[PDB]
Every structure is written in structure tokens, then in C-alpha cells.
Amino acid sequence: TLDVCTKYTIYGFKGEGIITLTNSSFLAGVYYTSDSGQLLAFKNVTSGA
Amino acid sequence: VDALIEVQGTAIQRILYCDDPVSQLKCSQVAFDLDDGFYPFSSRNLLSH
Ligand SMILES: *[C@@H]1O[C@H](CO)[C@@H](O[C@@H]2O[C@H](CO)[C@@H](O[C@@H]3O[C@H](CO[C@H]4O[C@H](CO)[C@@H](O)[C@H](O)[C@@H]4O)[C@@H](O)[C@H](O[C@H]4O[C@H](CO)[C@@H](O)[C@H](O)[C@@H]4O)[C@@H]3O)[C@H](O)[C@H]2NC(C)=O)[C@H](O)[C@H]1NC(C)=O
Ligand SMILES: *[C@@H]1O[C@H](CO)[C@@H](O)[C@H](O)[C@H]1NC(C)=O
């Protein structure tokens, strides 16, 4: 569910927070993280999201 | 082969091989260009194995 604070667990990475949508398309990567290893960004290949 | 890599928002470019002694030098300083000056270097010890 989108744009709401919730408990999540994605690919073995989990926490509590608000998922959000951006538009910055990138031709490489399904996921991304902070340099601190905090998994901020991730991609959706099927939808392009 | 070892070389430096640039990533530009999931776009790579400006790649130079590290298959040369002085290039391996520039590779050691990970700088596309270096200022003149004094730098301490190792002896070439890659003659025979
Ligand atoms: C990245 O994010 C995208 C976007 O969410 C994910 O892809 C979507 O996945 C969801 C399900 O997880 C899909 O949602 C459904 O899509 C229907 C239309 O899309 C097709 O897919 C369904 C099966 O889901 C087919 O049966 C259908 O014929 C379509 O051809 C919507 O119509 C759905 O709503 C319907 O179903 C729900 C229950 O599921 C009902 O409650 C509704 O009332 C309605 O009847 C539903 O929304 C979505 O289609 C997917 N989109 C794409 C583009 O694939 C990715 O999986 C995710 N990850 C990656 C890596 O991309
Ligand atoms: C969403 O799309 C708009 C329309 O071009 C754009 O201005 C905005 O930057 C996009 N959001 C992103 C890239 O996070």
C-alpha cells in the first residue's frame, strides 16, 4: 500500500516507513540504497515503476 | 581487466584501461588527471615469475 506508514519487509530488508513514488527513470537497477546501506530507492521492472 | 569506472545516473562513460605501468599509476591515484609534482613509486618488479 502506498504513501502510508506501515511495517514492511522487502527482499530481506524491512522496517517501518512510508513508501513513495518518484519518476526518475534509470536503465540500471531494480533497487538502491544509501551509502550508509539504507535501502532508499528501488525500481519496478514489470511496470517500469 | 582493471580500469576506472564512471556512473552517470545509470550511464557509464570515460573508461581507461589500467594495462600500463604509468596508467596503473594514474589508476593508483584514481584521478582522470593529476598535477605535476613529487610522488613516491615502487620499483618495477614484474620481470619474471
Ligand atoms: C512494480 O510495481 C508494479 C505495479 O504495482 C507491479 O506490477 C503490477 O502488479 C500488480 C499486482 O501485484 C498488478 O495489479 C493488477 O493489475 C490489473 C491489470 O494488470 C494486469 O494484471 C492482472 C493480474 O494482476 C491481470 O489479471 C489483468 O488481466 C491485467 O492484464 C488490475 O486490473 C488489477 O486490479 C484488479 O484486480 C484487483 C485484485 O488483484 C481487484 O481488487 C481490482 O478490483 C481489479 O479487479 C490489479 O491492480 C498490475 O497489473 C501489475 N502491473 C504491471 C505493469 O505489471 C510489479 O510487479 C512491481 N515489480 C516490478 C519488478 O515491476
Ligand atoms: C515526475 O514527473 C514530473 C513531470 O516531468 C517531473 O517534473 C518530476 O521531476 C518527476 N518526479 C521525479 C523525477 O521524482
Mutational pocket test of ligand 1: of A10, A11, A26, A46, the residue with most ligand atoms within 8 Å of the beta carbon = A46
* Determination approach: cryo-EM
Taken in order B49, B29, A35, A22, the sign of the CA dihedral is negative
Q: Considering only alpha carbons, which residue of chain B is nearest residue A32?
A: B10
Q: Is B3 exposed, middle or buried (0-12, 13-18, 19+ CB in 10 A)?
A: exposed
Chain B residues touching A26 at Cβ < 8 A: 9-10
- Collapsing DSSP states into helix, strand and coil, what is residue A39? coil
